Design an enzyme around this catalytic site. Structure first.
Site, PDB file in Angstrom:
ATOM      1  N   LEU A 187       3.400   8.809  -2.665  1.00  0.00           N
ATOM      2  CA  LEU A 187       4.123   8.141  -1.589  1.00  0.00           C
ATOM      3  C   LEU A 187       5.331   8.931  -1.125  1.00  0.00           C
ATOM      4  CD1 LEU A 187       4.038   4.431  -2.706  1.00  0.00           C
ATOM      5  CD2 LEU A 187       2.419   5.810  -1.369  1.00  0.00           C
ATOM      6  N   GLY A 188       5.968   9.657  -2.026  1.00  0.00           N
ATOM      7  CA  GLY A 188       7.130  10.429  -1.643  1.00  0.00           C
ATOM      8  C   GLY A 188       7.724  11.130  -2.842  1.00  0.00           C
ATOM      9  N   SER A 189       8.635  12.046  -2.535  1.00  0.00           N
ATOM     10  CA  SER A 189       9.341  12.813  -3.541  1.00  0.00           C
ATOM     11  C   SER A 189      10.679  13.259  -2.967  1.00  0.00           C
ATOM     12  CB  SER A 189       8.519  14.021  -4.010  1.00  0.00           C
ATOM     13  OG  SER A 189       8.951  14.464  -5.282  1.00  0.00           O
ATOM     14  N   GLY A 190      11.618  13.531  -3.861  1.00  0.00           N
ATOM     15  CA  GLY A 190      12.917  14.010  -3.420  1.00  0.00           C
ATOM     16  C   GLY A 190      13.918  13.959  -4.549  1.00  0.00           C
ATOM     17  N   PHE A 250      15.103  11.549  -5.816  1.00  0.00           N
ATOM     18  CA  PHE A 250      14.768  10.411  -6.663  1.00  0.00           C
ATOM     19  C   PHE A 250      13.653  10.710  -7.659  1.00  0.00           C
ATOM     20  CE2 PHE A 250      13.306  10.275  -2.284  1.00  0.00           C
ATOM     21  CZ  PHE A 250      11.926  10.084  -2.338  1.00  0.00           C
ATOM     22  N   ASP A 271       9.441   1.595   5.141  1.00  0.00           N
ATOM     23  CA  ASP A 271      10.859   1.518   4.871  1.00  0.00           C
ATOM     24  C   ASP A 271      11.628   1.419   6.179  1.00  0.00           C
ATOM     25  OD1 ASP A 271      11.078   5.002   3.992  1.00  0.00           O
ATOM     26  OD2 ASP A 271      11.737   4.142   5.907  1.00  0.00           O
ATOM     27  N   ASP A 331      24.028   3.207  -3.052  1.00  0.00           N
ATOM     28  CA  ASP A 331      23.315   4.006  -2.069  1.00  0.00           C
ATOM     29  C   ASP A 331      22.630   3.100  -1.047  1.00  0.00           C
ATOM     30  OD1 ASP A 331      20.999   6.893  -2.259  1.00  0.00           O
ATOM     31  OD2 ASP A 331      22.559   6.277  -0.789  1.00  0.00           O
ATOM     32  N   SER A 367       9.315  11.468  -7.948  1.00  0.00           N
ATOM     33  CA  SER A 367       8.007  11.531  -7.309  1.00  0.00           C
ATOM     34  C   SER A 367       7.354  10.177  -7.490  1.00  0.00           C
ATOM     35  CB  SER A 367       7.160  12.645  -7.923  1.00  0.00           C
ATOM     36  OG  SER A 367       7.917  13.849  -7.992  1.00  0.00           O
ATOM     37  N   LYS A 399       6.726   5.844 -10.601  1.00  0.00           N
ATOM     38  CA  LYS A 399       7.825   6.746 -10.298  1.00  0.00           C
ATOM     39  C   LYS A 399       8.127   7.606 -11.509  1.00  0.00           C
ATOM     40  CE  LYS A 399      12.641   6.725  -8.721  1.00  0.00           C
ATOM     41  NZ  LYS A 399      13.540   5.933  -7.832  1.00  0.00           N
TER      42      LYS A 399
END
Ligand SMILES: O=c1[nH][nH]c2c1SCc1ccccc1-2
Lengths: 273, 8
Positions: A12-15, A17, A96, A135, A19, A35
């Site tokens: 779904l995403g990475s960064g 935070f 989001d 955040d 993966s 996660k």
């Protein structure tokens, strides 16, 4: 036995935070998010009601995960040699709030009021549980498109809530208050209110007001979209330069722009279907 | 103008 109890799907995403993967709990086909967090990339650690040393994010998610709320729930978690793995709720369908605002532009005030109200309830919930998110931003808010419910995510920059000064910060700089830019210190609630002012401008104008430290400490708010006076007043109040001049969470929710809020189901039916 | 995400 982690790999043989959740069916792992697409990334779904990475960064900053980690993966995050889509997943289904094989037990009951429940949608989950998986996660991963590299142990070497962790700053703050804590311990739970077991003494086991875990990342602060796990501590905070456990403190807030009790019951129903507008916060993403931590279903489970595992330790590995070089990582921690977190099993989290996954709304479906979902988007989001950053992508939603990009696609739709500046939101109608009725929709911004419902969204902003739900975020305020969620943040109040965290503070009630002794947790400070640190955040708050559109990127860290999920929209359950079918139920019209907003979910707060990613406590990887959070802290236990306290009343003394914070002198550390690893959240998003463009949502951080001027007292952090100028003096590297802030108090938790007043800084949260500042980020919520950034968030509300972002919803009603289509993007955040400030990109640069000079703009942040300048505390001038130019409205690039037609916005009602009552809503401009709430935004400017949240973004007072002096922290003590900012409103409390009670004062935000009693503000006249915040009245007659839509229910989640109404919000979905009117604005999201 | 350009709208972007912001890391942390
Ligand atoms: O800490 C997080 N970062 N990203 C996500 C989480 S909680 C579950 C989630 C579900 C759907 C999409 C993204 C995410």
């Amino acid at each position: 036995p982690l790999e043989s109890q959740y069916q792992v799907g697409p990334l779904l995403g990475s960064g900053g935070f980690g993966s995050v993967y889509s997943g289904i709990r094989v037990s009951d086909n429940l949608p989950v998010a998986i996660k991963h967090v590299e142990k070497d990339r962790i700053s703050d650690w804590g311990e739970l009601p077991n003494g086991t040393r875990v990342p602060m994010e796990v501590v905070l998610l456990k403190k807030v995960s009790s019951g129903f709320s507008g916060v993403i729930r931590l279903l489970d978690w595992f330790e590995r040699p070089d990582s921690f793995v977190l099993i989290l709720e996954r709304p479906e369908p979902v988007q989001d709030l950053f992508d939603f605002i990009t696609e739709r532009g500046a939101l109608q005030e009725e929709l911004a009021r419902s969204f902003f109200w739900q975020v305020l309830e969620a943040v109040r919930h965290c503070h009630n549980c002794g947790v400070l998110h640190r955040d708050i931003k559109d990127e860290n808010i999920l929209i359950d498109l079918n139920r019209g419910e907003l979910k707060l995510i990613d406590f990887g920059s959070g802290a236990l809530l306290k009343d003394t000064v914070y002198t550390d910060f690893d959240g998003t700089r463009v949502y951080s208050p001027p007292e952090w830019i100028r003096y590297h210190r802030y108090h938790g609630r007043s800084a949260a209110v500042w980020s919520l002012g950034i968030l509300l401008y972002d919803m009603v104008c289509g993007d955040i007001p400030f990109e640069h430290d000079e703009e942040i400490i300048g505390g001038q708010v130019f409205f690039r979209q037609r916005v009602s006076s009552e809503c401009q007043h709430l935004i400017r109040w949240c973004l007072a330069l002096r922290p003590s001049d900012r409103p409390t969470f009670e004062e935000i929710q009693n503000h006249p722009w915040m009245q007659d809020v839509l229910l989640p189901q109404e919000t979905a039916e009117i604005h999201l279907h | 103008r350009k709208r972007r995400r912001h890391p942390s």
